[PDB]
Structures are given as C-alpha cells and as structure tokens.
Amino acid sequence: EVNSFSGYLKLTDNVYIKNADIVEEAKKVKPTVVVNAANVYLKHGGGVAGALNKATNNAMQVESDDYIATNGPLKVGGSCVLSGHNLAKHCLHVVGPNVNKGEDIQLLKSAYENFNQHEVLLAPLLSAGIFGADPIHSLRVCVDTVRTNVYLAVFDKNLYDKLVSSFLE
Numbered sequence: 001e002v003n004s005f006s007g008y009l010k011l012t013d014n015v016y017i018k019n020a021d022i023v024e025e026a027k028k029v030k031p032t033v034v035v036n037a038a039n040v041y042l043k044h045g046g047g048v049a050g051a052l053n054k055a056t057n058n059a060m061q062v063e064s065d066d067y068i069a070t071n072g073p074l075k076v077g078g079s080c081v082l083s084g085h086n087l088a089k090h091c092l093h094v095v096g097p098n099v100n101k102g103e104d105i106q107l108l109k110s111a112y113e114n115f116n117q118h119e120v121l122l123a124p125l126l127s128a129g130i131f132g133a134d135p136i137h138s139l140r141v142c143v144d145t146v147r148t149n150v151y152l153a154v155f156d157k158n159l160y161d162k163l164v165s166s167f168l169e
C-alpha cells in the first residue's frame with residue numbers, strides 16, 4: 001500500500017501529527033517523500049539528519065556530497081530533491097533557520113513553502129530541537145503555510161502533547 005500512514009491525529013484538512021520517530025515511520029510507510037531537517041552543506045552529522053543518513057547506511061551522505069560538489073550549498077529557507085534510498089521514493093532536504101546560530105526565524109515560512117511542491121510528505125517539525133525555534137511557533141507556521149498533505153512525526157511524547165494542546169486552544 002502507498003503512503004500507509006497509521007495512528008496520526010488530523011489537525012487540519014492537510015496537516016496530521018504523530019508521536020513517532022521519523023526514521024521508523026519512513027521504514028514502515030515508505031512515503032513518496034520524506035523531509036530531512038538539513039543544513040546548507042548537507043552534512044548529516046547528528047539529530048534527525050544523522051538518523052536518516054544512518055538508516056541509509058551512509059548512502060545519503062555520499063549522494064549529498066556529490067550534489068554539493070556540482071551545485072554548491074543550499075540557502076537557508078531552500079531545499080533540494082535527492083533520492084529517498086530505502087526510506088522513501090525521494091528525500092526533500094529542507095534548510096530551516098538555526099536561531100541558535102543567529103539565522104532569521106522569518107525564514108521558517110520559506111522553509112515550509114518548499115513542501116508545497118509535493119502532494120504528500122512525511123516530515124519533522126522544522127527548526128525545532130537544537131535549531132532553537134519555538135516548536136509551538138513552528139507548528140503554527142506549518143499549518144499556515146503548507147497546502148499539500150503533510151504528516152508530522154515528533155519523537156517526544158511530552159512535546160507532542162504540548163503541540164496538540166496548543167493547536168486545540
């Protein structure tokens with residue numbers, strides 16, 4: 001079966017959310033697109049990006065280095081489409097701003113706008129965790145910006161509960 005997402009909670013007509021590890025979701029669903037929470041040189045050194053790359057046994061990193069060699073780095077707020085390897089048909093590498101490193105939070109809207117080029121996506125909550133954005137704010141930007149069908153996997157039950165309670169106020 002195609003894009004067989006299970007156990008999500010529908011927030012809006014096109015945004016769904018689950019307490020889950022995006023890696024485990026990608027292995028089980030094999031979505032058309034999985035979003036990586038990338039940086040501009042596509043160096044998948046830790047967190048979500050490191051986990052997705054490890055699940056490909058480093059194939060994603062080798063492919064990413066080849067892309068950067070030919071094309072140069074991405075911009076903050078930008079994206080590129082590469083192979084999804086064993087995780088998906090395609091991986092959409094999206095660079096959200098890292099506000100812990102001084103990048104402008106306004107670029108989070110630009111980052112989510114990249115999702116609109118794909119009908120269905122499995123994605124993490126952009127710029128959350130160690131990128132330093134307020135995760136409640138990131139969910140609001142996602143809801144207001146994404147118009148295609150997005151399935152958010154958030155790997156922390158405490159944060160999941162806080163996000164759902166915020167959405168339902």
Ligand SMILES: CNC(=O)c1cccc(-c2cc3c(N[C@H](c4ccc5c(c4)S(=O)(=O)CCC5)C(C)C)ncnc3[nH]2)c1
Binds near residue numbers: 023131155
């Ligand atoms: C097999 N699994 C692993 O090897 C593994 C190991 C180690 C980690 C994971 C893993 C983490 C994680 C996740 N974290 C969220 C999150 C969202 C966005 C960003 C980050 C973190 S960041 O990496 O800190 C910076 C980039 C933006 C947290 C809860 C807010 N959300 C979904 N799926 C996840 N998976 C799997």
